[model samples]
Target: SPIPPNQIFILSGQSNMAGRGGVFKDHHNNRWVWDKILPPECAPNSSILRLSADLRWEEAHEPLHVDIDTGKVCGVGPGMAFANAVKNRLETDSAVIGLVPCASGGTAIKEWERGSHLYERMVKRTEESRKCGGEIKAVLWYQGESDVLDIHDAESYGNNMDRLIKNLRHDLNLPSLPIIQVAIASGGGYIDKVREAQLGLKLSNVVCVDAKGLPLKSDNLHLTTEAQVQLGLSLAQAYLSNFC
Candidate 1:
């Protein structure tokens, strides 16, 4: 029998990070709803575990953040796909991927400030996730859309992220925690500057994965199901390349 998770990864950020793939509209009660689709790449596996809202480890699956992203429609997200990709490459007996979902849809970066409510929730989860025993390996961040809406927010974007990373590291006491961040596409409002800020980050142990050129959903804001799969693979690739 597997010992469950021996390695942990955090899925943090906003809507795209939480996933909107397979979510539909123009029908079905005349509003958006999750299609509950699960791609082969994001399938559930016994070796993959999720830290539940009740703080228990369950077999990881699609709509990974359903509990965490409460009161919101969630469909296919990259968490399971990322787990599958990274787990397969590990020494089977030595690793079980534990994913801690801490993302909320449409949240601004400032909400993740140190000692803040959302940030503390994330911290508590990360700390608690390890109670069952596993190394907190990395954080996959995808927020920034909100901050890009204003010139001021766009200007401080880099430092804001830097502070975020620094605070996370300080709070967690892991000086070199790896971060695999999704550099989101043009979701409007000073989008270019946001992209530049995201891409221009020079933090070590933090890697940037572009969400541009990827297919988007009808809203032209979130990623498509297939794109989420691809994005997951990319995140896994980034993790393996630099942090593994």
Candidate 2:
């Protein structure tokens, strides 16, 4: 049954967007595993649906990206909380939030260029998610850690990011698509340059939610579960403030 028009939000980028919060080392297994913590802010709701890896729509909950960001153990991310926040704030009771999770654990900006595996998959998935009928409201991006390790990648960050967004908008046939990106919270080496690129984006309809002070996990690379909640809330804030 056709219920209501859905507001689509694409969750893309690396670990933080896929969510590394609450992921910790399992000393016995000698590998990092998600702690499986679901905060109230990230709780599931019927009106909130997620585009699963297999291209199915399901009730969204915490740890939104599982198989999508396959390289690392998935934990609480900004998607669910952001969706819930948007859903709760919207006065229209019938509007639903459809999230498309497409973030990979560790990836560079170049890897997301047009024709790349990640870019193609995300484009297809987002297109597929709209098959049943929905409007792509925005793309929520949180990445750049890997690029910070290399000077060239870091220096070219802004240009690459611009191209990525422009290409995405072109592929989706949606000019002026709203984009909500997060400034990196944790990284080293050329991180400052990368963050500068993020904060300095000149694209219209693009807004950045700064995650600079968010608490990180023991690895000092990923956000903690609590920080994910805060980030999610902030992402929602940015989205609602600009596009709603």
Candidate 3:
């Protein structure tokens, strides 16, 4: 059978999207078992595409740590859930969903600016994927934790993000493609302020998703397994509401 091209959904953000909260309890169940699936609010849609695992890098040759207690960094997160919802809702077969996850814990927006090394890395990765015949449909961004520090002004952060988005659209040849920005979850004192700045961009094609009260782990910085699923469904609902 000819494999249909999957609608690529890029997941780029900070620690949360990098799978910090925990790992999934079950690692072997890829098949859809109606009974095992999380409810729609968490599982959202079973038809959506999901990467078999997390696409995060670790220190040189360090065995990636997996939280056995909660399965936080195990299988999927809000990004995968949301992508799956988008993929299954719009396509018949599970679209070829590629997750170009380029995120690092404690990274500032300054590192993601155009011409920066991190920016170069992200571009290089995307290009490499495309060289292998992958197509990117949208970019889901969930960051701003590092930038919440008062050291940087809101204007600077906003400008950098705007420039980053513009450069990304230009370089990827997706000038008008959707950029779904996941607002930083509830936490630090300046969380809402930072989220306001990200949402206030006013880009016609850019969409913003909220992650309030989605359950947090002991760290209170990332979403737990239950919360991750909730966040994913929430994002998926937001996207569906906007386009459908």
Report lDDT per candidate: 0.87, 0.90, 0.61
> In candidate 2, residue 42 scores what lDDT?
88
- Which portions of model 2 show Cα errors greater than 4 Å? 1-5
Error of 2 at 55 (Å): 0.8
Report the lDDT tens digits of candidate 1 across residue range 73-141.
888878888889998888576678899999999888878888888899899999999888799999999
Ranked by TM-score, the better of candidates 2 and 3 is 2
On residues 162-201, what C-alpha lDDT tens digit does candidate 3 reach at each position? 8889999999887887788877875585676788788778
- Regions of candidate 1 where Cα sits further than 4 Å from its true position: 26-28
Candidate 3 achieves a global lDDT of: 0.61
* Candidate rank order under TM-score: 2, 1, 3
Q: How many backbone clashes does candidate 3 have?
A: 11
